[PDB]
Design a protein around this ligand. Sequence first.
Ligand SMILES: [Zn+2]
Length: 36
Amino acid sequence: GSAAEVMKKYCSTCDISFNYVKTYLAHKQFYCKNKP
Ligand SMILES: [Zn+2]
């Protein structure tokens, strides 16, 4: 068994998911609340 576990469509820090990858992109861009 490989310990891959993929999930590039869910911002754990925000606690949300996005079916569309484009959403996750635009999210981490300037939509995410991951302020410095
Ligand atoms: Zn986020």
